[PDB]
Amino acid sequence: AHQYETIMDECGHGRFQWILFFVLGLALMADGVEVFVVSFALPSAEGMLGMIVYLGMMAGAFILGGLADKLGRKRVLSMSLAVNASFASLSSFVQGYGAFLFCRLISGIGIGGALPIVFAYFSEFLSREKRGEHLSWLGIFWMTGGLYASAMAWSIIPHYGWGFSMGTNYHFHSWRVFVIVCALPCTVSMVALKFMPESPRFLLEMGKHDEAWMILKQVHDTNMRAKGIFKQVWDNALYCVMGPYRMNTLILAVVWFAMAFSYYGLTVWFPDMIRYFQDEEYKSKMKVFFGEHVYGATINFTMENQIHQHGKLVNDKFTRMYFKHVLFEDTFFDECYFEDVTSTDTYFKNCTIESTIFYNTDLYEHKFINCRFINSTFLEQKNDFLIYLVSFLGSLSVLPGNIISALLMDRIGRLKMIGGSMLISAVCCFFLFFGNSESAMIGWQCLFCGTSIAAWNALDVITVELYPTNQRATAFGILNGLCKFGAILGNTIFASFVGITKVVPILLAAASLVGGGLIALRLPETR
Amino acid sequence: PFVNKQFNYKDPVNGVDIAYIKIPNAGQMQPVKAFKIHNKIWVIPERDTFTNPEEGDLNPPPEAKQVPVSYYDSTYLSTDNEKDNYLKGVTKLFERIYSTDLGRMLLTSIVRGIPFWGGSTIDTELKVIDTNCINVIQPDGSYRSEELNLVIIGPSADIIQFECKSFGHEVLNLTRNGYGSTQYIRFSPDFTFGFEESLEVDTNPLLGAGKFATDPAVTLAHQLIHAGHRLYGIAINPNRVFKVNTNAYYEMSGLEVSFEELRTFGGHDAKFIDSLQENEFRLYYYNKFKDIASTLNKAKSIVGTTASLQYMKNVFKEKYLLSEDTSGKFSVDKLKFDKLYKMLTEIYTEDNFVKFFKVLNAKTFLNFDKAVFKINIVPKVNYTIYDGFNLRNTNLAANFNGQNTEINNMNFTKLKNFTGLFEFYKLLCVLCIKVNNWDLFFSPSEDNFTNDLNKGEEITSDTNLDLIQQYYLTFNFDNEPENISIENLSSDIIGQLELMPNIERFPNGKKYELDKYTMFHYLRAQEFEHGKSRIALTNSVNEALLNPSRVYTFFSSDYVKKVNKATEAAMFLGWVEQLVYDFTDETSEVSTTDKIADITIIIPYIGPALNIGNMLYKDDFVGALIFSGAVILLEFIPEIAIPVLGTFALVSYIANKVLTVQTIDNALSKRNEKWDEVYKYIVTNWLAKVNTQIDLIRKKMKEALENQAEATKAIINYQYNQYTEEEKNNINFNIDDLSSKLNESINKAMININKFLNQCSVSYLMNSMIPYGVKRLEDFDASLKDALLKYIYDNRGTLIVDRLKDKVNNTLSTDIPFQLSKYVDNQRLLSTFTEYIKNIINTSILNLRYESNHLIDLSRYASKINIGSKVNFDPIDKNQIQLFNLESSKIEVILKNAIVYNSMYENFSTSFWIRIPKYFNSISLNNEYTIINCMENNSGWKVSLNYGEIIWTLQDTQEIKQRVVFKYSQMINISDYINRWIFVTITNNRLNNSKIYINGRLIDQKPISNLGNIHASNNIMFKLDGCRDTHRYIWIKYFNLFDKELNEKEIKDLYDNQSILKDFWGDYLQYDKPYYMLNLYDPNKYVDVNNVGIRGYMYLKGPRGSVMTTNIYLNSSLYRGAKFIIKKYASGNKDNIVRNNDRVYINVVVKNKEYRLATNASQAGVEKILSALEIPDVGNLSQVVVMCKMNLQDNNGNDIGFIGFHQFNNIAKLVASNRTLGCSWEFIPVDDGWGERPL
């Protein structure tokens, strides 16, 4: 390892490592856009039914994550991103929600094993001394992914309900083109990976040292010109946990679970909380009507946000109008006529409806509660942009917090950084309680995010520096699967805990971060 | 097509479809031409002089055969043009018989029936029969033997003798042992029989004379059915002959009718054989098929053929429908054997082909053919490819005029039959006369009918148009055995025809001496020679028979006095009008005395006309018939005797619980089957020995009336000829109009005489035949009940109890109703029977009917009929009664003080029609109120209504109430029990049970045995009582009471009896009134208009929606779609009521403007999309519609199609096309009783 390290040090940093860094940041962008399309696109397409794809990611992170250490890093990444791109393109040309969700699940299977492979790949190419910086830089691509995936989303599909609707025409296919275009970074990465070579350290590990010498010579020449078996893989995974690597992996798993719990809970909690705040503000408004006697009136316009009590609507007529958030209680209709009336959230209660006609309407049976009809009849019957905006802003908030981690991890360390960041984020979380406003929420959101990226970067480096080239991939893979696990958890609890309480989720979050930021310290030093 | 590549006559001798042929024969026969027409069928254009050696000449024999009609010719078929025409005709007949699906199945059955190769003396070998193949000689010089099934050869010496022959064997009787063989059909298509039919006037009262020609397709079909019986080896023994008695003077001298002819005729004739002989034949044929299956199992070798033994075994197992259980062990199953036997016997009949072809044919073989008609079939302008002689779109199609010679005379030419008009004759003397043989009564002998009634029976644990289409659907196709290669046989195929049993020549010229005049003397006394001398009518047969110039008549003395008077030129027109009017007067007379049981129209002048019973007076005949029933009409009384029916023995499984219940159930089932079998035997005996005499009497009346008309117009023309030139030219006259009007009078009289004879036969059956069976049969019931009682107690209890004794006392104390619907088809007979029972039973306790502007009781028992002031009557029909919820909306009926008993109502019934409005007010829930009352002092009965249910309550003095209820829900999409006319009847047997029936369907029974004494009400109350609703009103009509309990049969037909088209509610449909539309096939949708005009169309859309009121009713909306109005087009009735077969126009209201309905029939496709046009439309488009179904007709009378709908792509458009449904529709008049609000 000494001679390989020395020759890699002599190779230095130049054109080749930058080109590889770009063609790998493409895959990290693909991972980011997958996280976005699973956490803010499917849940608004239908609820958290699509989340199951996260579970699929888990399997990928263990199936395509641990396999690479026994088979290869370029081949495994090639296959994984190829299957992701192919099945996403197939998902684009799909009719029905079930087939689309299955295609998304297999795409998640394919992509969930990309992050461990890309990090392990790039870790065997850069100089030992200048290792923390460049790896850290790669992280930003991940975040950029979400930003891009958000920025385009509100431009293409700012209309919820596109998932559970197949009776529409061949138009309204904005979701189809969105799914097509979200597979762009992975497609460009697949185009690019034909030129990049395999991992030199892994290739030397397997054998054929002449090929390793050839790739080392090619890297050196490029830099000079610029400057002028599943049994084996399961036993390998067990060798990463219940063996010499026992305490380190346990601590790393705890830290990864804690961060992927708190972060992936809050990132989805914040847009939900802002929507709930807007909903609470809206509900505060209503016209109460008592003792009406409406005689011979033809209604044509739209009346909204009203309640009627003890009304006596005699010989009325509702034709070609919109009912919006209007309630009827104890109202006595009489020979009224309903024609081409379209209703939303309206509900009739205890009403006596007599001699009416409901022709060409959507006022179904379920809109009537404890109502008595008399001589009546029933004839033939018929943007959440902010969310995306909020998401974008959050993803964007970490960019400044990343550079300040990029050119600093070689000074403070790889253990102090994560510890501090986690603890600092937990403090910010404890200030949330105080905040109660649109500006307040997004401010807190941004703040948290900005201080919640150094940790992730430190985490990535510490988890890729510890294990050797013969357990790295496998190890990274399982920690990524566990990260995907924490994601599901936070994105489920925090999500469900909206409009019932605020302290509980926040306290919970704070606790997790504290816990992780206190256990992170008990880790082998790597400098 | 069945026959492709028409083969002309002068095509070459290629060898596979046209070739020279050697037929099997006893001796030597020269090469003979023929044309293969299909697989395994051949047609030989030559006369049959080769099969039978005795027939070497074509000269008529000196001894004419005992046949009703026959023609002989020796130069027929001689020339080549005749051969070509013969073959064209036979090809056309084959394609026509193949066209109909039933005929298609028959042709397939003929094709598949290859004879069995059982000719090997060694049991384990299969060899072809030497005598069932034909040697085809090729032009090269060599011949090849080929098997086949049918050969068509020109007629024998007797040209019109069409028959079937087979080549027999020395020891094997092929035709009756399951083997079968090739059949040779002596047939010709160029000649047809001519018979006479007098039972068509029911459908076509404008029919003239008879003399109809039988469709040659039917005759070929009869020959084909004979063949089909013979290929499967199921022919009945020819020596089994339906023998007749020939001793008496009135008995027909003799004629052979084998049972195979009775089977092949089918229909009415098939009932001449009892079930016992049929069962014997079925068992024998099943045993023979078991034998052939056993032989096929035994055989493991074949010699003389190329193909595999397995292939021939497959062919034979398909032919005989055998089953092999994967072990090479063939077996036949009783189910498939029964199906095949029924298909060959009961399905393939002449009657079914006649029904499918819609052509005339004699209903019985007794109607002997009376002429020979030369026809021409080759041209299509005479005999259409599809519909026979009845060409569509022409005058011949209507009234079956195609088969009528006197209209379609250019197609049929009469020939002189060579059987003498009086060659076979009998002599009658008292003055001697001669009678032709074929004009006598048919008297079957008693030996032809047998019974196994006396044989006892033991019961063990386990003992026991449309159908043509189901058989066709189940039928198999695409499996026709391919032509097979065989080693060629010798140059000459020796063989003898199947031996026919000898028939001795029946004696001719017998003399009979009698002390009385028979009807033959009277029938001869009305004939004449139409000589030059004047012919005089007379009232004495003794002079008319003796004097050739005097003719007997049975009309009144004034008539003969007039017709014997000379008159002058000015007087003759008055003379002829007087005589035609008077003739109609005698021919139209009917007696009014109807106290006799169901002989309502007694016609007197039948007496002196045919000397029935030896009276010469109309009044004396009427008295004799009234006294003696229908016996006097029959020439000889048919003896009927039912011996004692055998007992029933039950086996006992000691300590059994569920097998014994099965034993009693099987006992009941066999009781029912025994009742059915004895009724069937009685019916077949009646039909054999009663109906034939009545048919002969009807024919004699028809010919008597025709002879009277002949004599009348003969004497009139004699008087006409007396004039000089100036009188005959100045005073015109023609005989055609006189003949037409006299024939029409004959027809109107003949309708009456036909109906009269119908009730005579039916009354005789119901009176003097069924009691003899029923007495022995109820004695059998008594013995069976005794046996079941002995088992139901058996002085022990280790058994399984009151329910069993209740059941046995119930069913074995009552009688099963007797109906011929399950025994006969003759529609005329069917109607008379049922119509009778119901019409007579009408007379009952109270017959409340509103006629003559008053509500009266036609049963002349009701004392007084009170009418309230607040009752209402329907102007369109005065018989409807509307009752309101007011005190004076009341009707009181004063029941006769005679029939009022304390313990009456032991067996009685009520029936009426109710229309109920739709309940609105919620207080009416659980609000019971009596609508009809006959209860006094806490005893009587009452009919009451409550929320959607009808309640019949019986109540005795001792508080024992019995309520039977019929309920229906109001929350249903379509209802048959609201605002509709509902027939309700209640049957009561105070001994056993009370039963309720609605519109003729079973609903509920409850025991009323616990009821004691139920005192009779003084009067009958019609009033709402206790109904809290202030608007409730009823509709009731045709209320009737029955002093005896009724039965399912008499109640169901009653429904139809009391039932002019009706609307949804059952009320009369009316003209110039709007109506909504509803199709029964698709109820949930309504009709809608689109862009009216020629391009416009009607379509089906929806859903119709729903109108409801909570916990009271829910139902789909009814007033949906454009309303339809109906107005007169050519109906002459002043009133706006529609009746059946009324041609009217149909209009529709669209945005309150009226549109014609019409369509263009020239559009492609059978479906004719109708359209809504403006009133100023063009008359070319079909808009006349006949009347619940409606049929659109073209302006020329052609039926465009039944009005319905077709699913034209995604639009359910409306069509007039020529489906088991879609022809059912319904009109919805606007009704105040329903209450749904239109807009």
Ligand SMILES: *[C@@H]1O[C@H](CO)[C@@H](O[C@@H]2O[C@H](CO)[C@@H](O[C@@H]3O[C@H](CO)[C@@H](O)[C@H](O)[C@@H]3O)[C@H](O)[C@H]2NC(C)=O)[C@H](O)[C@H]1NC(C)=O
């Ligand atoms: C539901 O509709 C039904 C029928 O559509 C209503 O019942 C009807 O009420 C009217 C008004 O009282 C009755 O009219 C009567 O006419 C006679 C004759 O002209 C007049 O003398 C009376 O004074 C009265 O006006 C009508 O007979 C009655 N129909 C029936 C079948 O009862 C009913 O009121 C409506 N509402 C409810 C809650 O049922």
Ligand SMILES: *[C@@H]1O[C@H](CO)[C@@H](O)[C@H](O)[C@H]1NC(C)=O
């Ligand atoms: C509905 O209204 C009726 C009459 O206005 C009243 O009697 C009834 O109690 C009401 N029901 C409820 C629970 O509002």
Ligand SMILES: *[C@H]1O[C@H](CO)[C@@H](O)[C@H](O)[C@H]1NC(C)=O
């Ligand atoms: C409804 O009708 C009113 C009265 O005729 C008319 O002023 C109004 O413009 C109509 N509604 C709309 C939205 O046009």
